[PDB]
Amino acid sequence: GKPLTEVEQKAANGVFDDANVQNRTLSDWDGVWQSVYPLLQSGKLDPVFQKKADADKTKTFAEIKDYYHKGYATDIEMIGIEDGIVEFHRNNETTSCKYDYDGYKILTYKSGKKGVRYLFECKDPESKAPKYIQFSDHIIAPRKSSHFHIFMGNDSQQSLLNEMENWPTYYPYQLSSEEVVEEMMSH
């Protein structure tokens, strides 16, 4: 929808000044989302890997697909976000919490690029949802997400900050596999 400003555009590419990063509310991720892992498991995402492989030298289709197989792997098939609550659908069962915002963390990847993770924490003893979750979606300022990676854990926020190999990814539930694929065939 909104035209990604020059900043938003470069930011979406890991290039930005820390002074341009701003807090974001949980509502930026409101909606019902589908994990893309089952799509990969059923070959629905092969075209995307084929394209990334016919452009990446030293990388074969299988090598690329193996990279994303590890990256997308998760048992949380669906996520629901609404009115401050995040709900996780695992095995026909669900868990949720009314998450508290804990600021963000600007990361500097070894590739030189930068990224921002938005941290939330569950402070409800009753709940059985992950204690710490972090959103990352190439957005550094208020703006509704179109899809996102989410890191979840029960050890600590720092702990989630070190994870760089597994990043469960989610797209709007209503999108078909074809639509999800076309979207990935861009950015």
Pick between residue 20 and residue 98 the one whose CB is nearest to Zn ion.
20
Q: Give the helix/strand (H/E) hosting 164.
A: none
Cα distance between residue 131 and residue 116, in whole Å: 20
Applying CB under 5 A, the span of 53-61, 68-76, 108-116, 179-187 interacting with Zn ion comes to 179-187
Measured CA to CA, the distance from residue 91 to residue 110 in angstroms comes to 36
Q: Which is nearer to Zn ion, 26 or 36 (CB)?
A: 36
Smallest gap from Cβ 18 to Zn ion, in A, equals: 3
Which one of the spans 47-55, 63-71, 109-117, 146-154 is the region binding Zn ion (CB under 5 A)? 146-154
Please, which residue, 70 or 123, has the CB nearer to Zn ion? 70
Rounded Cα distance, 28 and 146, in Å: 9
CA-derived radius of gyration, the chain? 16
Binds Zn ion (CB under 5 A): choice among 1, 2, 18, 57: 18
- For 34, 96, 160, 187, the CA distances from 4, given in Å and listed in that order, are 24, 32, 28, 11
Contact 170, 158 (CB under 8 A): no
Q: Is 187 annotated as a binding residue?
A: yes
Stretch that binds Zn ion, among 29-37, 111-119, 138-146, 156-164 (CB under 5 A): 138-146
What SS3 class is residue 147? coil
Considering CB under 5 A, how many residues would be counted as binding Zn ion? Answer: 4
Q: Is 93 in the site for Zn ion (CB under 5 A)?
A: no
Pairing type for strands 148-153 and 169-172 reads antiparallel
* Binding residue for Zn ion, selected from 89, 99, 135, 148, defined by CB under 5 A: 89
Residues annotated in a binding site for Zn(2+): 138, 147, 149, 183, 187
Q: Give contact residues for Zn ion (rule: CB under 5 A).
A: 18, 89, 146, 187
